[PDB]
């Protein structure tokens, strides 16, 4: 009569193999051809990619590994690559019932028309299966009923057809008791203006109950230059606290008033992340920070930061479904979060996100080893 015990989560979007959505420019660059040198950039990362996030498929595989049950909603073709992906997910035990297969479209491929009329112009003739799903039948109402969290990323807002479907799905979940999680993960086209982006993402933000944004994303949305100027303020004559006497990295806590431009009534929680180093949380009644660490140099020749963001979002979802007092008690939330930081640390120690996403036992052991007994 009731549903199975660990509550279910739904991940909606496109299944892509190892795709990093966020791209901006970096001042430091290495040799064009020798790839044995590129590891150095992983050791000292460009900031936007301290904990790179990824495709919606990856979050599901991690949730299952950390304990938990997940389902993936999307369309893949009946081609060979498509079948490989479903096999991987099925093998990892992610529910694949809501995946639709199409015979007229091919996975990973988009047809474009390149036209030069004094400018390089590309226009889209046909779209990828992943980016073409429809409300009508692609939506399994059964999965939507059991689910207690719906997870989407911002890529869906870059295609007209999936945008329409996302909104039908959000509505149906709320009817059946669901809570929506928007993990932003901004794509390259959406890093051009604060103004164009705020408008494109607006409807989604307001229909969201839990939101995760990176430090670089939050500043992009609000006063990016103002924050940059602040971090380069060095006092002229005397320091005002003994902290400024010590030359250490900035970890500013954004005051609740600053984030007011972006709050809405149905927002239970907001998380801002700075790699695995800091995680800031904001709630209708309380605010704060959880301290963390990162050691990619313990294994210098097998370090990749590619799925670390997916892992932090997964640990959060796992603890939130199981522990319900996180929403109202500050201490519980903090203690619980330290588990998510741990998942991220372990995901930076292997090449490839799917290889090396951590298991629950391993994550508890690292929490216990890294933190003092009282904190844990």
């Amino acid at each position: 009569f009731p549903y199975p015990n660990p509550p279910l989560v739904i991940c909606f979007g496109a299944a892509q193999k190892e795709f990093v959505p966020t791209v901006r420019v970096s001042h430091e660059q290495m040799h064009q051809d020798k790839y044995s040198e590129w590891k150095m950039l992983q050791w000292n990362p460009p900031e936007f990619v301290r904990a790179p996030g990824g495709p919606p498929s990856n979050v599901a595989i991690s949730h299952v590994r950390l304990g938990g049950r997940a389902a993936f909603m999307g369309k893949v073709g009946n081609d060979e690559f498509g079948q490989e992906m479903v096999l991987l997910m099925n093998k990892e035990k992610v529910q694949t019932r809501a995946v639709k297969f199409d015979d007229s479209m091919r996975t990973g491929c988009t047809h474009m028309k390149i036209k030069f009329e004094d400018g390089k112009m590309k226009v889209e003739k046909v779209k990828e299966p992943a980016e073409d799903s429809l409300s009508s039948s692609e939506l399994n109402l059964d999965v939507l009923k059991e689910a207690r969290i719906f997870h989407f990323n911002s890529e869906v807002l870059t295609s007209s057809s999936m945008r329409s479907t996302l909104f039908k799905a959000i509505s149906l979940s709320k009817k059946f008791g669901g809570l929506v999680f928007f993990d932003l993960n901004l794509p390259l086209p959406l890093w051009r203006s604060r103004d164009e982006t705020r408008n494109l993402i607006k409807e989604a933000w307001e229909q969201a109950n839990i939101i995760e944004v990176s430090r670089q994303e939050l500043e992009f949305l609000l006063d990016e230059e103002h924050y940059e100027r602040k971090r380069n303020y060095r006092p002229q004559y005397f320091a005002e606290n003994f902290e400024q006497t010590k030359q250490r990295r900035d970890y500013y806590h954004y005051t609740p008033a600053e984030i007011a431009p972006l709050w809405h009534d149905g927002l239970k929680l907001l998380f801002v992340t700075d790699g695995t180093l800091r995680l800031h949380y904001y709630s209708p009644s309380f605010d704060g920070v959880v301290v963390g660490t990162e050691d990619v140099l313990i294994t210098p020749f097998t370090c990749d930061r590619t799925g670390s963001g997916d892992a932090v979002v997964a640990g959060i979802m796992r603890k939130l479904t199981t522990q319900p007092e996180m929403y109202h008690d500050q201490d519980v939330l903090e203690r619980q979060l330290r588990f998510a930081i741990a998942a991220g640390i372990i995901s930076q120690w292997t090449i490839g996100a799917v290889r090396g996403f951590p298991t629950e036992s391993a994550t508890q052991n690292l929490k216990e080893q890294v933190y003092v007994p009282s904190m844990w």
Partner: peptide, 23 residues
């Protein structure tokens, strides 16, 4: 052993039965 690679998710089955088998 193609059967080994066919999973129940693909053969449409009603929910109550699916949840039970997976249990």
């Amino acid at each position: 052993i193609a059967l080994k690679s066919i999973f129940i998710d693909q053969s449409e089955l009603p929910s109550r039965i699916y949840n039970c088998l997976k249990m």
